[PDB]
Amino acid sequence: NRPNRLIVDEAINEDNSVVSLSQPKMDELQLFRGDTVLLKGKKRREAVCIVLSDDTCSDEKIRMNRVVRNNLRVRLGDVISIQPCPDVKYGKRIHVLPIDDTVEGITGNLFEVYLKPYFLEAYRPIRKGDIFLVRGGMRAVEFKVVETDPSPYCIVAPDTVIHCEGEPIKREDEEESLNEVGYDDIGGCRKQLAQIKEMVELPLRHPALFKAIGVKPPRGILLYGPPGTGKTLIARAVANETGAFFFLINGPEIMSKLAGESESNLRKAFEEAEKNAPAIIFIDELDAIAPKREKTHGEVERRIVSQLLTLMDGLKQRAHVIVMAATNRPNSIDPALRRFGRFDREVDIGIPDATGRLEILQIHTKNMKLADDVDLEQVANETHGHVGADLAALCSEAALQAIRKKMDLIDLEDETIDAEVMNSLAVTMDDFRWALSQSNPSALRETVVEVPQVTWEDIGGLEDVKRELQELVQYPVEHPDKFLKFGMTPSKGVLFYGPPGCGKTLLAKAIANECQANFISIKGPELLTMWFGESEANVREIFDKARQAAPCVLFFDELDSIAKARGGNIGDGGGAADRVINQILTEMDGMSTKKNVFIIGATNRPDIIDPAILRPGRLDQLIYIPLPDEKSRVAILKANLRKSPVAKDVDLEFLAKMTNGFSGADLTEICQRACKLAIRESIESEIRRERERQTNPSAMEVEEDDPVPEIRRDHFEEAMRFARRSVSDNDIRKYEMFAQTLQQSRGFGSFRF
């Protein structure tokens, strides 16, 4: 904005209070070579120093040394505003104290005998509270400005009486000061941040603007959303930015055993904040404070709610008194509070987008370098979009993998950590990749289950169908811009018709494993419940979570048992099944985001399908999964033989032609039978060899252990003679009936010329 916020470049000079300023900088700004100006930093970091005139050492950028940046808590290139500081007079009695972590080793009076001329007639106008490292006693002793009788920026001179005690400042306070709060895990919440700042900064920095507006801003602002995902971080950032009193209020804080203790405490806190400053009511974890005074069976709870309403909703109650209200369950909100007057403003915190995800992830990762040759934005784009502290979890997992790699190459190092080895021990993209592979969305973790790993390539047959499914998954994500340009929405209700479990459920599992996005698998009997409406509530919660867990895949497995039409038997019983169907339609329909609704339909009996969800929109398509052709038979056979030892004497083509009517489950069964025969033969051979060795001295290291590591053609012939296809002509007829229904529902191509 203002030109006074010049970029904070790097100064070649090691002087802390000297900034190399360009001739244009020293000229356009009222910046002489000996002008004591004040520079404002982050989190109200104000200091006064000298402006050196170095045209060749600055190009419209304030060359600042690393000591200056550390003292001011600012980075390089920062647009720091500079204003004249001529009010810096000599301090009367300035309290000073060295830093324990910095004065450790410098024996004696390492302040008066080390930095003697550093403050005596040295014109040191430093803020009251700053710590500067001083080279004394072959060390760098940092003395923190304990206090100053004059104002913060006081010109420490020989006339200034620097009060000094033997208080050594521990490094814990140093870390806490370095533990500032800004936009490190918050990416994309620009609207909310702007609203808060306007409710605070514009309210403060432009109070006359509000006065001319003739209306006060909203004193009661609510912050809905998933808390602690940065919500607590949001409050911390506000408090760090806020200069007014932040009357932090915990949730289970005022409720005490004594009578009326909570209400008295609340009134006392309100009065203290009012008399303190134009404070903001940092009502932390305010969500569980009142059930709208309707379900409030607790008389103490009712009294607490009434007192809270009186304090908040009250005439001439909140004068320059903001109410930092944070909500984790917006539904749990009280009735009166949700209205303006009790909370005039209310905001909901949403999950971040992949761009905001990359921003927040990079900002969080700024503390370290865990991959020098990898871009965190590349992974974040590759990341599905797990949000909140998901980035923190990913960083921690990468750090754990790196530590595993390092301490694997290192010893226990209980006291002898090799610092050079410790110095950036690991910065690897592989660590990030392993973390991500070991990472998953924490919200769905309670619903997460272990599944076998299988590749879309690892499954043989239905190559066109697999390609179509993969394209449907990718294009919806990979080319969202292309969809926007075309201006069309994707399909959701993909079903599958045929004998399931022949690889059908296996196909779903392989897709989910090969799926870049999340996948939620639903069992048929999974959502049933006995309590009144409990099953419907569970279904609603699952749908809501999936909507929140974008992207995700609704693997509604065994949907045949859940998709029965309302009245498929002589009568309905209980009626809750119809309620569940209606709730599913409410999920299947209704105006909402449906960002990644990947509904997977699995049903062996299409006749057991309720047409309403089976209808278009509510259903996208059904995969009429037929039996494998001889080509598909050979494909499935090769896929099965992937881990098997192959015998050149096995005529796979001859079997596939013979096993025209067989099935993928049948092929797997034949393979298992041949394997069992081979295993039995091997066990018998081992027993015979041991018995011969039991009776006589015989060699043990022989290849007879695997007389046929590949498949014995005899084993294959025996498996063929064992069983045959389980395909039913009546089942074939039913499948063909469903297919003919679909086909008569279809028609010839337009080809309109």
Binding site: E112, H163, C164, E165
Partner: peptide
């Protein structure tokens, strides 16, 4: 820690 109570480092 104290202010103006200890004899200071005179120059």
């Amino acid at each position: 820690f104290s202010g103006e109570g200890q004899k200071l480092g005179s120059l």
